[PDB]
A paper describes a structure:
Specific damage manifestations were determined within the large trp RNA-binding attenuation protein (TRAP) bound to a single-stranded RNA that forms a belt around the protein. TRAP consists of 11 identical subunits assembled into a ring with 11-fold rotational symmetry. For crystalline complexes such as C.Esp1396I, whether the protein is intrinsically more susceptible to X-ray-induced damage or whether the protein scavenges electrons to protect the DNA remains unclear in the absence of a non-nucleic acid-bound protein control obtained under exactly the same crystallization and data-collection conditions. To monitor the effects of nucleic acid binding on protein damage susceptibility, a crystal containing two protein molecules per asymmetric unit, only one of which was bound to RNA, is reported here. In this structure, the bases of the G1-A2-G3 nucleotides form direct hydrogen bonds to the protein, unlike the U4-U5 nucleotides, which appear to be more flexible.
Here, a methodology has been developed whereby per-atom density changes could be quantified with increasing dose over a wide (1.3–25.0 MGy) range and at higher resolution (1.98 Å) than the previous systematic specific damage study on a protein–DNA complex. Over a large dose range, the RNA was found to be far less susceptible to radiation-induced chemical changes than the protein. The 11-fold symmetry within each TRAP ring permitted statistically significant analysis of the Glu and Asp damage patterns, with RNA binding unexpectedly being observed to protect these otherwise highly sensitive residues within the 11 RNA-binding pockets distributed around the outside of the protein molecule. Additionally, the method enabled a quantification of the reduction in radiation-induced Lys and Phe disordering upon RNA binding directly from the electron density. RNA interacting with TRAP was shown to offer significant protection against radiation-induced structural changes.
Numbering used by the authors:
A (entry chain G), B (entry chain H), C (entry chain I), E (entry chain K), H (entry chain B), I (entry chain E): 7 to 74
D (entry chain J): 7 to 73
F (entry chain A), J (entry chain C): 6 to 74
G (entry chain F), K (entry chain D): 7 to 75
The structure:
């Protein structure tokens, strides 16, 4: 099952899980401060992930960067 | 399952999930502001995804860009 | 399961799902306006897809372009 | 399951599906006009696909052209 | 299942399916006229395929040509 | 889903011979190809080895090999 | 199942496993000192991993480096 | 399931199938004359194959030659 | 199932297996003298492995080196 | 569908020794090869380790290696 | 299932299997003299392998060398 790597490039970046299922709402928001790295799978509970704030992101499709 | 990465290049980009099944309709519209990134799977509920607004998109098939 | 990416290059492009099974007919036609992207799986209900109108298409086999 | 991409290069192209099973006959013919693209899987009901008319075809084994 | 692409380079090409099982005989011949393409799988009923007449053939192991 | 071999006859009377799967090994079928005909043949529940006699151009997943009559 | 490699680049690095399921919280924090390497899988109990502190990290998607506060 | 290609480079090349199971002995020898090719699988009955005589051999690990 | 290779670059390298499950603690420590190699899998009982001491390490993601 | 090793004897009397799978480990068979013969041998229900003694050229999925007598 | 190749570069190399499961102990030590090759799988009974003595080692991650005593 795949995962995504998120490195925060400033304080207060939010990595947000969206619920798997008929319903789509947030469920959890993990706060990363500058320099922290989160490596997060898709799961039974999470089928979409949003990143808000400035971060360096790696997936199986390559690098992408979110901007705050 | 496969997933798509979508980076909003302007405010109010919509990532819309179409229902899996005999019937096809929108079940969910996720609004991304400029610079946000959504990493979204195909799932039991979502078998097609439509992007409206300017965004940079990655899929297993490479890059493509939606335009406003 | 495989998917196809379709970017509409003009207004009114139609992405048409054909039914899986003994019977073959159109069960849905999704209209895309210019610059919209649709990423669409093969599914239990859809075993062939037809694109009509000017579009840029990616699949596992590479890029192809439909014309209006 | 694998699929074929067909792009019609002229009007009137036929993409014809052949029945899986002990017997072989055509169960559907989809007409493509010039510039339309069909992406079609092999399925429970279709184990062979015939293309008639001028089209650009892609499969996992690369490009081929019908005339 | 694997499949073979056969493009007929002259009229009257025959693509012949041989029965799966302890018995081997031809169960079907699909006749192709010049420039027709047939994309044919191996199946519960067809464990060998013979081509007669001039054709350009593609398989997973590359290109081969048959000559009449 | 099994592997397959492509055989192109380079002369008349080429034989593609199927050997039986199981405790018993014997020839169960011999397919005659004449010059320029092609046979694409799988390994199967009944065929666990394939013998080619005569001049033929053969492709497997391991590459090209040629049999000589 | 996938795993991540983490090499601590200073003392006191924490590799934090987050619980799998509807609930998200830290269930374990593994402390690494300078020079030590942890190779950790995703598991039934850990579906996200956070790294705090300076570390050199490899995953299937390539190298990334965490930086400490 | 894997297979070995054997091309006889002289008469009387012997391709020898060894029994799968707790016991090991040969259960079949298939002789090849010069220029014949044998493509043989590993099977429920054959878990090791010995080639005697001069032969050109392909396996998934490359080419090897037996000397007779 | 994945494995790591550990080559000890000095005496007393410590390869530490952490218990798989809701609880985390070490369940085994295998010490290596200089020049010894351990090739160890992830298993039902081990889901994280820590290396202490100077070692040359190979995994599917490349080479890494622990320092004592 | 297991892996297999290719052993080509470079001298007479090479031994390809199968070791028993399971809790116990012992030689269950030594196949003797003479110079120039090739054995292609799988891992199986009964054989989980293979020892080669004598001079031989060996191929496995990780490359070529040579045993010496 | 994966395997490792070990070629002894001196006499008396040991290839040691560690038990799979909750208990970890050596259950077998295979002695190789110089020039002999052992190709050994991970198994229901062995989930880690230690090599002691000078040996040339191939795994799916490439070449490694153990250095003797
Ligand atoms: N308990 C959460 C942990 C998690 C994994 N991926 C995430 C991405 C975003 C937020 C939380 C998560 C889950 O299993 O789904
Ligand atoms: N709850 C939705 C979440 C989702 C995943 N991918 C999406 C794409 C678009 C909109 C919503 C989604 C689902 O499980 O299907
Ligand atoms: N409800 C449709 C959605 C869909 C997927 N791919 C498509 C292609 C064309 C039209 C509709 C679709 C289905 O699950 O099949
Ligand atoms: N109902 C048909 C649709 C179809 C798929 N691929 C085709 C190729 C040709 C004709 C029809 C089709 C099926 O599932 O088999
Ligand atoms: N009804 C046949 C159709 C077919 C598939 N592949 C073929 C190759 C040759 C001739 C016929 C076929 C079958 O399912 O087997
Ligand atoms: N009836 C035979 C047909 C066959 C497949 N591959 C072959 C190779 C050689 C001879 C016959 C065959 C079978 O299913 O096994
Ligand atoms: N007992 C934990 C061990 C572990 C694996 N990966 C981790 C990452 C971080 C923290 C602990 C872990 C588990 O099986 O999940
Ligand atoms: N009946 C034998 C045929 C065979 C396959 N591969 C071989 C290699 C050598 C000798 C015989 C064979 C089997 O199924 O096992
Ligand atoms: N009867 C043995 C044959 C065998 C396979 N590979 C071997 C390696 C060495 C010795 C014998 C063998 C087995 O099935 O296991
Ligand atoms: N009987 C042992 C044989 C073995 C396989 N690989 C090993 C590695 C080291 C020592 C013994 C072995 C087992 O099946 O596990
Ligand atoms: N009995 C342990 C052996 C082991 C495998 N990999 C390890 C890594 C570290 C320590 C012990 C091990 C197990 O099967 O899990």
């Amino acid at each position: 099952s795949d995962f995504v790597v998120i490195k925060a490039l400033e304080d207060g970046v939010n990595v947000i899980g969206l619920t798997r299922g008929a319903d789509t709402r947030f469920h959890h928001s993990e706060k990363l401060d500058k320099g922290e790295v989160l490596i997060a799978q898709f799961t039974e509970h999470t089928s979409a992930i949003k990143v808000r704030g400035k971060a360096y992101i790696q997936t199986r499709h390559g690098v992408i960067e979110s901007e705050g």
